[PDB]
């Protein structure tokens, strides 16, 4: 069985998560303790600055323990919500697309690689003539390979970017305390709502316009019936319509998620 | 075997020379074919002119062969054609046999940056 | 076997490294100590003076003078690891990041190369229909071509960049003495930031896609089992999605550091 | 005997004269053509191959016009580079005295900026082609002339190797006009 | 006879003057541009179809000759295209800016307007470099590509790799001068303004 992006994805999606998250893990885990502590001892600072001198508002010392608070709750149960999310948001990709992805990719390449490889038997039995077609399979291919190839690879730097984007998570929201810290959270936001954009808008257009073309390709066969000109500049023709629209496409999502501000 | 280009060299003309000599094979064993003609001719105007039955029936048999010394000439002419097929399809395999070893997987060797 | 990538590797890093690298550090390892003796010279000459002479030395002058010391010294040490790093970095960032550094290109090539130089055999073994596998090898031979090139293009080009800028790292770090030169050795550790996060980013991704086509195509075997035109579509989808990723990774690199600032 | 680049240079060279011929009446390498040769004979020697068969041979005039192709492509990329900036830089050479005028004004001096902006932009990227493109090149000749088809050397290592090098040297040709570019405006 | 950029330029003004110009009157109312380029691409196709010709002759190995005969035909193309494709783009921005003109100019009357009277400006300062750009540098270029195709022979005097090398990196390196010349044309008209 044709089953390429599912195995692919499947490697490459185990490394990254394994991989990231055992190291987020190892860390967070290890560290929750320590921040604790740490807290304890800042309650503990905050008695000597009651109780011997130097104060300063001990109401306004209320708002700074919950904005510290708060941060600490944020970073330790977005470490959780991050171990959990990665999958969250691989389950979310399929089915965004569905609404699998690879399952119906492998399904559409594999029906326009069966006309290819049609193509090429009709060649092979020639012997002779059998160089038109041979280029017929060439063209179908690399059409079909192309649409494929340029999707699937946009979608997987979607999705490692967002697992990078929340393995490094825990940082940024800790690093939310000051001003210039609040800078570097402004960007953090701006690149996630960035690429969240561009998987939501590649997994639509993926889906509708290759489901197009794997209909297409199934309803072309090769045989007496079709005439075998205007069949390979359909396919041709479908192939660099979705592969400019999905190339053009990213530009302005980066636009859009940069404008919104 | 060797060098490749002693392969190219080889090929070309022994191709050259197979059909230089199957043209001129052709032509002398044509000039043969009318020598023989020439000897028929005078065979049958000194049978014209027997005189005794047993004459006639040894110049028969002196015909007849002939005409053995002929059907000899065209096995001989078939059997040269047949060889003639055998080596055009045996340089061919030669051919076969230069282009699988110029481009065979078993080479290793590869250019290398100095 | 495939030896192309380890050797042009060794070549870039013996060429251009010697020239440039050795020049500057023979001139640096040249006209240091002369430097360092008069400045040595200079600085309790000063102190000498302030001595005896109008009152120039307060402990801010020791400040300056220490804060200036530490700078050369901080520059010199820079030229000494210069060499020592330039040596240590070339060898061991792309071999560390992600046996040896090219040696996975090499033995990934060396795999596709392989593969392709089979359907040339089968390609001349019909010789009349025989040329339908022509192209095959063809387009494998072009696939993993385009994919190793770029890899190690952006890996030649990421080196280099930190060779030179290691090279001109002296003269930059001894340029922030004032005020205007500070603001020009503000880019040249901007440029340094970029092009490290670029060997990075290729090199972890580059050895896991190679890996990936690697194992894939080792895999790869032309018999009666395996429909040769889908194994083909699967090679070039594979080579493409590469392409692409390696292509979106170097803006990716220079908009962050320029977001570090 | 390959002389492709010799002719142009000389032309191109001819229009300078004619510009400087136009501003005189109001006032009034090779290294690239050698490899390139190695190239297209390592290419030209399977073209020979693919006519010996004349049936069978259809995989090495493939294997010839891909070569051929890589170095075409190489070399074209590189020396349109090469002559583009030469010929900015002359035609702005040319109208330089133009430019320098504009000491008589204070609000003309922005004008200066941006003639030096664009003249130490088109240099720095004569300097960096130059060197980069005759190292690349240089390489490229040795590995080509180093090839061969022959009963030892595999075909499919061989020209992967060529076609890997003539993408890696055009990927870094493309990269460095816009460094040059940008550290030309940083300087600036 | 090679009638191509003489009738497209002639077809592509004839309907810009009837929709444009004398709309343009309403509102009011209240040797040869292309033919040296078309010269040249007549030698590189008249080679073209003289190795498509030889490639016909052989009809076994008659594979090889029309791959040449394809790259020749593909890189003069590609070029006279580029070429031709950037002087009717040009064309068709000057003759819409001149139809425009007239309202445009007479809209800095308040001085609101201002800006969109730099803008038109800008545009038409833009656009009339860049066909002087096209002019001499494509002028140039198609005159050399000419006489390099017009002065190719197959014959066994010339080797076929050299010769089809050369056309290529020809092409190539015109295409890149061609392509790089917009930039430097807005980066001028910008710096102007």
Known sequence: ?261 | NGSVADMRRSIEERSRTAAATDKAVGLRAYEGAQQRLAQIEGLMDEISRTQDQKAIEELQARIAGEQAAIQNETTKLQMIAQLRQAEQALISEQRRERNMRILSSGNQGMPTIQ
């Open chain 1, 1 to 261: 069985a044709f089953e390429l992006f599912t195995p692919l994805f499947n490697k490459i999606d185990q490394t990254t998560a394994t991989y990231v998250t055992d190291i987020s893990s190892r860390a967070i885990a290890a560290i929750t303790p320590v921040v604790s502590v740490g807290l304890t001892l800042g309650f503990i600072t905050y008695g000597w600055l009651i109780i011997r001198g130097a104060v300063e508002m001990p109401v306004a010392e209320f708002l700074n323990r919950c904005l510290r608070i708060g941060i600490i709750v944020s970073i330790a149960l977005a470490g959780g919500l991050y171990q959990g999310e990665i999958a969250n948001a691989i389950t979310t990709v399929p089915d965004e697309l569905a609404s699998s992805a690879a399952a119906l990719v492998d399904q559409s390449a594999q029906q326009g690689f069966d006309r290819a490889s049609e193509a090429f038997e009709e060649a092979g039995f020639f012997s002779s003539d059998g160089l038109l077609y041979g280029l017929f399979g060439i063209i179908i291919l690399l059409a079909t390979g192309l649409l494929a190839a340029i999707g699937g690879a946009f979608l997987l730097l979607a999705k490692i970017a967002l697992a990078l984007l929340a393995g490094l998570g825990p940082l940024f929201i800790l690093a939310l305390i000051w001003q210039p810290t609040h800078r570097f959270f402004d960007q953090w936001a701006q690149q996630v709502l960035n690429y969240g954009l561009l998987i939501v808008l590649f997994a639509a257009v993926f889906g509708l316009l290759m489901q197009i073309f794997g209909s297409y390709m199934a309803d072309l066969r090769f045989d007496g019936a079709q005439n075998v000109a205007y069949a390979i500049g359909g396919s041709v023709i479908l192939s660099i319509v979705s592969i400019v629209l999905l190339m053009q496409l990213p530009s302005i999502a980066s636009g859009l998620a940069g404008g919104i501000g």
